[PDB]
Amino acid sequence: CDIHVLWEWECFEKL
Amino acid sequence: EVVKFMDVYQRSYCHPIETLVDIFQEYPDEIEYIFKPSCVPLMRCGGCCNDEGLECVPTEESNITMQIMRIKPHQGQHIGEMSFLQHNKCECRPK
Amino acid sequence: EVVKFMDVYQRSYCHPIETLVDIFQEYPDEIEYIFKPSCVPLMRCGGCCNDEGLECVPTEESNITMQIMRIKPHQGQHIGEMSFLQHNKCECRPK
Ligand SMILES: [N]
């Protein structure tokens, strides 16, 4: 996900 | 009882939040005077971004005018309008 | 169009207010870690007492525990519990 915008949870389980 | 991760993350993420600001921060020329109240509630960008390389900054601003008392040593009380900057929208941008 | 004195005065007077706090301010020993979020929302004393010599202090506290992620670009992420102090009551007290 774009680092500049508020994330959903999948943005974090793609870390 | 434990706050869930996504709740924390969403609540702290960069946004305009009511912040109690000391009038002298905004009006540093006036430190030898006394204001009542001495601090004012403003909407200001706060919280955090997804990366320590980004910062939470205003992308829309406006003025708010408030009725504030000011007194200089040995003078009488004045009261009047004082204007302060508010943050209406915030975004995370490179530092 | 102008916020009235008393409204400013009440709204800025010493009370507990939602404050966005960087985790390293609370856990400075932990700067070897990248936390996500990097800041947390906490009820904390803020505002003014309007009477230098009077200060806005916590008079009651509790803890709150939150799920925070700790990451390492090499390693996989962990999610852990971190506890923080909250201010439940604030009062204007002689410095
Ligand atoms: N990841």
Residue numbers in the entry:
A (entry chain P): 1 to 15
B (entry chain W), C (entry chain V): 13 to 107
Question: How do the authors describe this structure?
Answer:
Constraints caused by the lactam bridges and by the binding of the macro‐cyclized peptide to the VEGF site also made the α‐helices non‐canonical: in each of the four peptides, the residues P8‐11 folded into a 310‐helix characterized by a H‐bond between Glu P8 O and Cys P11 HN. In the peptide 3 c (ExxxK) the α‐helix extended from residues P9 to P12 followed by a 310 turn where Phe P12 O was H‐bound to Leu P15 HN. Interestingly the lactam bridge cyclization caused the side chains of residues P10 and P14 for peptide 1 c and 3 c to be in a non standard rotamer conformation, the consequence of which was moderate steric clashes involving hydrogen atoms. Therefore, lactam cyclization can result in sub‐optimal geometry with remaining steric constraints, where the side chains did not adopt the standard conformers (1 c and 3 c peptides). The real space correlation coefficient (RSCC) of the α‐helix was higher than 0.83 on VEGF:1 c, VEGF:2 c and VEGF:3 c structures, which supported these models. However, the NMR structure calculations did not converge into a single conformation. The backbone RMSD of the 20 lowest energy NMR structures, compared to the co‐crystal structures of bicyclic peptides and VEGF (see below), indicated that the bicyclic 2 c and 3 c were significantly closer to the folded structures than were the other peptides. In particular, the RMSD values in the α‐helix segment P10‐14 were extremely low for these bicyclic peptides (1.1 and 0.6 Å), showing their similarity with the crystal structure (see the supplementary NMR discussion for a more detailed description, including the β‐turn P2‐5 and extended fragment P6‐9). Helical folds were observed in most structures for 2 c and 3 c, resulting in a single α‐helical cluster for a RMSD cutoff of 1.2 Å. The location at lower ΔH and ‐TΔS of the preorganized peptides 1 c, 2 c and 3 c at 20 °C and 37 °C directly reflected the lower ΔG values in comparison to the other unfolded peptides.
